[PDB]
Design a protein around this ligand. Sequence first.
Ligand code: HEC
Ligand code: HEC
Ligand code: HEM
Ligand code: HEM
Ligand code: LMT
Ligand code: FES
Lengths: 111, 244, 244, 85, 85, 54, 54, 383
Amino acid sequence: KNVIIKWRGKPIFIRHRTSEEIEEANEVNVATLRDPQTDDERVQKPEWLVMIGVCTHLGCVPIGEAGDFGGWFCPCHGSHYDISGRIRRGPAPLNLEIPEYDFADAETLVI
Amino acid sequence: MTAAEHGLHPAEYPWPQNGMLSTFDHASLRRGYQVYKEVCAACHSLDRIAWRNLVGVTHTTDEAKAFAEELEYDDEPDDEGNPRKRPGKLADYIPGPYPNEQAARAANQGALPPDLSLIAKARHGGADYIFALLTGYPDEPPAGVVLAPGMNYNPYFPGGGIGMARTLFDGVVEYEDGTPATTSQMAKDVAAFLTWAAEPEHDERKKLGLKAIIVISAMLGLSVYIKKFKWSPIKNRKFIYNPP
Amino acid sequence: MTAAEHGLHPAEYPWPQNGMLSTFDHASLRRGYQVYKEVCAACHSLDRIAWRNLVGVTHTTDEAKAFAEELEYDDEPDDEGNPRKRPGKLADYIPGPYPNEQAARAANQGALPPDLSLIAKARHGGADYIFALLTGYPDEPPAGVVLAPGMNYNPYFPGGGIGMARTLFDGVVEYEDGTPATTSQMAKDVAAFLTWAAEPEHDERKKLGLKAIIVISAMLGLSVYIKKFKWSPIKNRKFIYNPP
Amino acid sequence: YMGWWGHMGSPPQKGIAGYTISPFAARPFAGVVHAAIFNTFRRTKNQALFVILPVSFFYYVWTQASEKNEWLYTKAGRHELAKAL
Amino acid sequence: YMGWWGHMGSPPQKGIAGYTISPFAARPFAGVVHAAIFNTFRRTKNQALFVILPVSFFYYVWTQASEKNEWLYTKAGRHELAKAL
Amino acid sequence: ATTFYNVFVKRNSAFVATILASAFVFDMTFETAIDNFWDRINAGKQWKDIRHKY
Amino acid sequence: ATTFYNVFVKRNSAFVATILASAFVFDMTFETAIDNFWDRINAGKQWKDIRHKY
Amino acid sequence: MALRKKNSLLNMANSYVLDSPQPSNLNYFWNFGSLLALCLVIQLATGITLAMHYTSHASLAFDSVEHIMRDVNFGWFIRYAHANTASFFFICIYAHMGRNIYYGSYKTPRVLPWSIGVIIFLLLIITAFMGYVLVFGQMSLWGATVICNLVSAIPWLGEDIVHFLWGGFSVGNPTLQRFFALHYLMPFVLAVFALLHLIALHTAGSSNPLGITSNVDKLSMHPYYSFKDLITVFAFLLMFTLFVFFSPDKLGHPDNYIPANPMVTPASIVPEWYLLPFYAILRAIPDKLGGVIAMVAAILILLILPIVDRSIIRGNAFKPISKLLFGFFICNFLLLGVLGQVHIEPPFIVLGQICTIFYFSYFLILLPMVSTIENIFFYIGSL
Ligand code: HEC
Ligand code: HEC
Ligand code: HEM
Ligand code: HEM
Ligand SMILES: CCCCCCCCCCCCO[C@@H]1O[C@H](CO)[C@@H](O[C@H]2O[C@H](CO)[C@@H](O)[C@H](O)[C@H]2O)[C@H](O)[C@H]1O
Ligand code: FES
């Protein structure tokens, strides 16, 4: 599941990723990526994808679970983000930004 | 960048208001309002324009009051503090189609149709861009363009894929003045109207500028005579030197 | 003016916070919050105070979050642009009993109960006035006073007739700290609380003032020594005059 | 009407010798207790009337006026107030 | 390094006679047409190189750069652009 | 010419008075003249030209 | 005394340095001293005094 | 003695604007000083007027500017006058600086007015940048974001300083309110420094286009330069009129008519035209800190002209090689301006680096070399 928390006006996507989702994200060779990053650079905890859910193209919010890389699909100009929230297809130049987030408890994060 | 990424630059069309001494054609402004009201207003707001702004530009006071009075606006609460509506007055702003951004985006496959009150100033190109965009949807996208779902190809829009579909077709409006409502005619009228909305001082500004040009030019000419006159003793000075 | 028209002036009570070096009694502040919450908040708002303001003054962070989370506040609209509520956060302001003035007046026979966030600063008298007013409703109005309908006699209120009835009676609150909740005790606590609400910097302000007094006093003493020292050649100057 | 150092606009000075000592050689608070008591007493005594007379007069005026005003707005002062308006 | 009228800081002047006529006695626009044409031509001709050389050079640079940039972002310029990045 | 000089120009009080009165007249007439010219070059375009239909 | 003068006072660079270092120390110690005094004269009144109940 | 000289107050006016002794041969480029005074006055008048209608709160700022354009009588004029005069202020200031560099106004004995002048130029940049933010359109926001994140390059404390200037963790309401207060204030500081550089200049007086002393031949500031200043005032007002009344948006950027949106980033964040050369210099250096230092150094390096110009002769009127070098310097400064608004793409990346090297090498290499050689040519050539 993926949550949407507003934080400084920007939406925050929080997805509780499954084991197989993590695996799917760890596949794509960094080389072939507009914005080259691995999931380990993105998440500090593999079960908590926390991103700023503004599309990097113009600034719509991607609809999650949709896409072609089964992550996030911006409906505005059709840009597809990954399970890491990396840009794969469409006009968007960058991957979905990561906020400064810390696990205060293992059950609560502060953003 | 690729030309595609920039968008095709719109032609320079000869608008009536182009020209240092030229006002808007107010009959075109009126027709443009009718296009806005019957086509654009479905999705786009015009939030910076009040009913009073149409008066003596496109409509008489009576016509504008009629338009305002057809709508309901939020009144001050009644005596039990319950909410109330009132009919609109000339001081009211023209109300938008959606209650908030979220409702707007939900109705437009995620895209938010911008408010059109400043759009003629807020895009490179101005009226020419609006005219080019509304008239520039090709029947078929150039072979090889992959449009995202819910996008329409339009070369004037940067990137090529715009969330707004073609909306002007011959006879979507029936003009009250008998003008044939062709796609081009409606785009010209609505582009004129939106340009007026962005810069409603335009006609007055250019008349005052004409007065300023004339006076300032005369003052410039006279200032040159006066300078030459006062300076002539210095410019005409002669010396005779006898070494001591 | 007659004394009646002015209102009786309240006594000077010895508040804990009176005194250049004295803070509020925070246990009284906490008890006063409980009186506000259980008695005044029925009619009076406290709109300038947020839940976070109680933290480390009267309540721990947990207690204040608990209070906030029990309430519903307006959220941003959902994705279809429909309105939504959320539970309260510490950043939220304490919500009022009425949606608008009209609703407030309708519930109070025309009178509008003021917001209490600044009332201790907004009346001559401050805490003493609040204390005097709440405790100063006589059983019977002085013989010959004609009260307007819906008015109550209270000599501290200018004119004598106040729209707020007596509200504090022995045991309307049950204090959580076992303090006997007498009319006087509750008035003292709530008056302390409201004074804090009006001036929450009070404790810090007076401590910084103590530091400033000490430093500025020392600098004043030293400045006098230095002045006398530098001036002594002028003050000690002597002359001998021999007429030429 | 004022010059500057060297040409201040003094009439010519001649015949005055001026003497003074260094701040470090002097006691800055020499005779301070005598001054604080006796000098301040002399200077205050000499100026006292110029403060006391106007202050006492205007205070008396105010006192009389404020007491009358207070009395006019009592029950006892009803009649006198009616005439005053 | 500058004084004021009367003591401006000129070396002593002697032997120069200066003459001029009143603004009301003179034609302010005397020989204006000759000056506007021949004098402006002389003064412009003498300064032309100092404007023409730098302007023409920097315009050429810009023209070459802008044309290359345009060409790199065409289809034809795909390969050259790939190398340039 | 001497007469004109003596009356309107010689005294600065008179000269300034003449300048200000001329400024008043210029201001009023120039306003009117520009108004009419502007209306002629923008004929049939302004609201005043179409108002009559409504 | 001469020693003290020669080291800390004679050179203005040293004097200003001594004044600033003293200001630093005063600032830090005075803060602490006032804090403790304020807490003693307002004992049982402050949040820190009642916090333990919660 | 005449009252204008006797009375202390009148005498100060007199010494600056009436009996001030001027060289008799100043050309039209000595008129930019008074135009800059006129721009400063127009900006104070229009500025104070807009402040009577503007609201500094971020929820209302953009709308208050629309209210000015739409509802306030002549509001459109006051707004466009203020916005366009800011561009004219920089045209006149670049001209005035150009005049000073070409004619050697920075040489002894005028180093002090020059050095104060360099600070006036910095204050003008800051003033104009803050004013740009007050609209709170897209260029306003994205300008404040980008420019205040340059401060992040200051080591150790940079991030902290940014958050302190913004008054929070992003550009928002606190930022806008503080820029309003500072934008109001800065023009007054700027006016004081303008007055200081004039008082400093009064000791030497104006230089003149021949570079020789004028002590031999002076003219009162009034009436000669009063009436000559009127010609350029009317020429300026003609240009002002053409922009303000006929093309009020020609110098500006459409993106500032879109309300600030922290989510949507504009297509291109480019500064106002007059800042573009400094922006190109910053882009040239790949390092963040390096770029910031270079950009500041591009202004502060003007302070060393008094040292690096080794000529025995003041100004360029008689120095053919120096005139050529100055031509190339000025054109390169314009090319930098143009490169400030192109995309960061080939081949403009390397070109911008070359132009940046040329900019600095004028002060550090060429001007010292050329001025040394011209000294020797004048001496040998006239033997
Ligand atoms: C039923 C929907 C709809 C109608 C009808 C419509 N629009 Fe739009 N319009 C949009 C949407 C959605 C966008 C945003 C497109 C995007 O950002 O991809 C838009 C964008 C625009 C833009 C700005 C494009 C840009 O550069 O950002 C202009 C101008 C515009 N519309 C004008 C009009 C005019 C004029 C009319 C009719 C006379 C009109 N629209 C009719 C939905 C509509
Ligand atoms: C059910 C109604 C009600 C309750 C309970 C109530 N008030 Fe009020 N209060 C009012 C109304 C109504 C007024 C305005 C009266 C007027 O202006 O005539 C008022 C006025 C006041 C005033 C201002 C008097 C002035 O000078 O204007 C203060 C202070 C005050 N209340 C404090 C309190 C405190 C403290 C409590 C309880 C601890 C309290 N109130 C309880 C209704 C109430
Ligand atoms: C050197 C003097 C000044 C300069 C260079 C300057 C420059 C600017 C600029 C560039 C803008 C942005 C204009 C826009 O695009 O809309 C602006 C806006 C503004 N300035 Fe100034 N300004 C100056 C003096 C002042 C002063 C003294 C005030 C007094 C308050 C002021 C008040 C404003 C206000 C309120 C705005 C915002 C409204 C608007 O954008 O028009 N300015 N200024
Ligand atoms: C508000 C901005 C400014 C104003 C109003 C202003 C005004 C003036 C005026 C009126 C003069 C005397 C007349 C003239 O020579 O034009 C002058 C001279 C001068 N200014 Fe400025 N100035 C400003 C900014 C600057 C700047 C930015 C510099 C330098 C970077 C500068 C450096 C000088 C110098 C060196 C002179 C003496 C030049 C000479 O006469 O030889 N000024 N200024
Ligand atoms: C520019 C706007 C107009 C207002 C004036 C500008 C304010 C700046 C004035 C404050 C600085 C004081 O200005 C200073 O005063 C005195 C007299 O006034 C001048 O003194 C000068 O003129 C007087 C007589 O006119 C002579 O006695 C003197 O020999 C000469 O140097 C200084 O050269 C000037 O530097
Ligand atoms: S806005 Fe996200 S796809 Fe264009």
